[PDB]
Enzyme design. Sequence first.
Site, short mmCIF file in Angstrom:
data_model
loop_
_atom_site.label_atom_id
_atom_site.label_comp_id
_atom_site.label_asym_id
_atom_site.label_seq_id
_atom_site.Cartn_x
_atom_site.Cartn_y
_atom_site.Cartn_z
N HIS A 26 0.87 -1.17 0.00
CA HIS A 26 0.00 0.00 0.00
C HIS A 26 0.90 1.21 0.00
O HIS A 26 1.79 1.31 0.83
CB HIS A 26 -0.83 -0.07 1.28
CG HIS A 26 -1.72 1.10 1.56
ND1 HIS A 26 -2.23 1.97 0.61
CD2 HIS A 26 -2.28 1.47 2.73
CE1 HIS A 26 -3.03 2.84 1.20
NE2 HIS A 26 -3.06 2.57 2.49
N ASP A 34 6.05 6.14 -21.54
CA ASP A 34 5.99 6.12 -23.01
C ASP A 34 7.35 5.71 -23.56
O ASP A 34 8.23 5.27 -22.81
CB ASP A 34 5.56 7.50 -23.51
CG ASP A 34 6.53 8.60 -23.11
OD1 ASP A 34 7.69 8.30 -22.76
OD2 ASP A 34 6.10 9.78 -23.15
N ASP A 73 -4.73 4.49 -4.47
CA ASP A 73 -4.87 5.04 -3.11
C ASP A 73 -5.80 6.27 -3.01
O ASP A 73 -5.71 7.05 -2.05
CB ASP A 73 -3.49 5.35 -2.52
CG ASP A 73 -3.46 5.24 -1.01
OD1 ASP A 73 -4.29 4.49 -0.44
OD2 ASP A 73 -2.64 5.94 -0.37
N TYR A 122 10.94 12.69 -12.82
CA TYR A 122 12.11 11.82 -12.94
C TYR A 122 12.62 11.32 -11.60
O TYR A 122 12.91 10.14 -11.44
CB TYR A 122 13.26 12.54 -13.65
CG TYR A 122 13.16 12.45 -15.14
CD1 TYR A 122 12.32 13.31 -15.86
CD2 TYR A 122 13.90 11.51 -15.84
CE1 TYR A 122 12.22 13.23 -17.24
CE2 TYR A 122 13.82 11.42 -17.22
CZ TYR A 122 12.98 12.28 -17.92
OH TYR A 122 12.89 12.18 -19.29
#
Lengths: 151, 151
Positions: A26, A34, A73, A122
């Site tokens: 969790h 992509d 979540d 990133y």
Amino acid sequence: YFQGMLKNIDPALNADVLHALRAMGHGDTLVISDTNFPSDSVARQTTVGKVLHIDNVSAARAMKAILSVLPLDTPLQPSVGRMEVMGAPDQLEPVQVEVQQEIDAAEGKSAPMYGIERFAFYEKAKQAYCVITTGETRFYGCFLLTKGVIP
Amino acid sequence: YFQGMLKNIDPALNADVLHALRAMGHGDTLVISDTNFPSDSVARQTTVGKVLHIDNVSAARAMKAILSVLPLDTPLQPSVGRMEVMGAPDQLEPVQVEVQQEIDAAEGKSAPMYGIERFAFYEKAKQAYCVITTGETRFYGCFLLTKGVIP
């Protein structure tokens, strides 16, 4: 490839992806990427340590497959992050609106994605459980999912 | 442990088991073993190369979990083998009748297990994709499943 498909489980989820989805806790995160994202380098830093794949499919098709088994979540926090288009935090690209449809379909309610700046995205990606790349060629077709919990 | 459970997938199937079930081809086999079988030594010879687990549960509970996702090759061949009780090929033990219920429930029709002599069972086990051991302590609580194919 339908080979080896299981009962009532989206066949696009291959064994390595199913493993990752099941093994995550969790609040663990994953990236759907992509073809543009540096998935190989970023994946080396993740828990799984190698790039996983739902190959040839669009980001939205990948999202549909992943959310067919993965709880988000959402009850506790916004749980799908998207990339912010440079200098336009509210702008959505076609690849992004398609993916939002799959999220809302899985949730059965409106669950708008939250924006993440490129650099932050990133850095978050490097902290993910895994990166799952796709056949999505369009720009800004990466997403950060947070696993929820079933009662 | 319900931790990390996925939507509409039996939570007893942990990540390593889900991976195996998904990665198997049509006609590949797996063994569900009791605590009596030499699962560690036999598993070293299987494709997976280590013992997998649905721990603490009975053979029938394990069968229920596995068949909730795994198609059996029933349309083409008898697809669950059981051990033959020594000197009584037709005799069924309580552990075996319980497991038959789960098979018939998954198939929605009568699909009687076929018998396998002890020695043959061991040799077949060594050729399986994996061994999945359980908390089944009763004698003769091992089964050989053959994966089918979804249309």
